């Protein structure tokens, strides 16, 4: 059991399966808390996650949540899944919501797991920001390529896939 | 008749005349669809554009619009009028609304037509982003200078003006 861990979940289609990660990670960290981007609420009912994680930080329920306290209360902060938008906001120091504010404050404990279409992944601006993040000690995991179900065509093509737990653990703990 | 074209309209005072472009462009492209930034809705009733364009993408009516499908469905994507804000968001890979998300995903089919006060146009940060966009193969039209009706004083002075259709077509097709 390691220290308290915070999941910063963003609006990736894969956020709908964030519960699998919470349960897995709860077997290795004292606490697993979660914080969502405003847009991810269009994909899931974030309320149900209260049943799996120790604490759910909701900026609508409480608009005055202390980002400094949140950062100090955790040893690890994971952006999972990390959207292109949030990755780029973090890289530019933009923090117009609680999630990004927490990421700016806790850049030293930040672990980013990118998830998006390979086409989005190729964006020049996104890539420049990913280099900037890495060159400034923000840990950015290298997306895995594999069989992914493409909601667009319903085909199982090759594309960026979500990281399995072993890889998450190894990237965060090593 | 060329392929399907998408207009990404932003909050420039000139968005109120976007219908003139839709009608003109509809004479040259199989389809002319439109997508607005949240802020542009304070300038016009976007609903009426449904009468001129083939399809209106509304992220409020449908928060789960697939940006990948939208990008794949078009051969050309025009940011017209393109605000300083959206230009700068695109340059930094920021996509916190459907319009900018579409622009990040379809950077390869992107054509940007800047419109703003000459004073805003002189902003250092805006200009660095415009260079960055151009140096990464995003087509950015060079704003035209001419008699523009300044709303501050009901007097026609010289400033940045909207591109006429010939120039739009030539910039997009050549």
């Amino acid at each position: 059991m390691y220290g308290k861990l915070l999941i910063c979940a963003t609006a990736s289609i894969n956020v709908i399966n964030i519960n699998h990660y919470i349960v897995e990670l709860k077997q290795h960290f004292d606490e697993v808390n979660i914080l969502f981007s405003p847009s991810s609420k269009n994909f899931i009912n974030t309320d149900v996650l209260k049943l799996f994680c120790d604490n759910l930080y909701d900026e609508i329920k409480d608009p005055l949540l202390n980002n400094i306290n949140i950062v100090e209360n955790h040893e690890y902060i994971l952006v999972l899944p990390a959207s292109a938008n949030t990755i780029n906001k973090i890289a530019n120091g933009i923090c117009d919501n609680l999630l990004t504010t927490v990421c700016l404050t806790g850049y030293q404990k930040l672990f980013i797991f990118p998830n998006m279409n390979i086409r989005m992944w190729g964006n020049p601006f996104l890539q420049k920001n990913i280099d900037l993040l890495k060159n400034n000690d923000v840990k950015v995991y290298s997306p895995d390529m594999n069989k992914s179900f493409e909601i667009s065509s319903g085909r199982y093509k090759n594309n960026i896939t979500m990281p399995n737990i072993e890889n998450v653990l190894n990237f965060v703990l090593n | 008749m060329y392929g399907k074209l998408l207009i990404c309209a932003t909050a420039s005072i000139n968005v109120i005349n976007i219908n003139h472009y839709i009608v003109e462009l509809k004479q040259h492209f199989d389809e002319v669809n439109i997508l607005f930034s949240p802020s542009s809705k304070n300038f016009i009733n976007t609903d009426v554009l449904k009468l001129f364009c083939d399809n209106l993408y509304d992220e409020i009516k449908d928060p789960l619009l697939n940006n990948i499908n939208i990008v794949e469905n078009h051969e050309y994507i025009l940011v017209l009028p393109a605000s300083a804000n959206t230009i700068n968001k695109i340059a930094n890979g920021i996509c916190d609304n459907l319009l900018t998300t579409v622009c990040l995903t379809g950077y390869q089919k992107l054509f940007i037509f800047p419109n703003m006060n000459i004073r805003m146009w002189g902003n250092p940060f805006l200009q660095k982003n415009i260079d960055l966009l151009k140096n990464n193969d995003v087509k950015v039209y060079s704003p035209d200078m001419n008699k523009s009706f300044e709303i501050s004083s009901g007097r026609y002075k010289n400033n940045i003006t909207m591109p006429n259709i010939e120039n739009v077509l030539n910039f997009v097709l050549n």
């Binding site: 289609i13 709908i16 998830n115 594999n146 992914s148 179900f149 667009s152 594309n159 | -």
Partner: peptide, 5 residues
């Protein structure tokens, strides 16, 4: 199972 747009 991972997803993609």
């Amino acid at each position: 199972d991972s997803y993609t747009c």
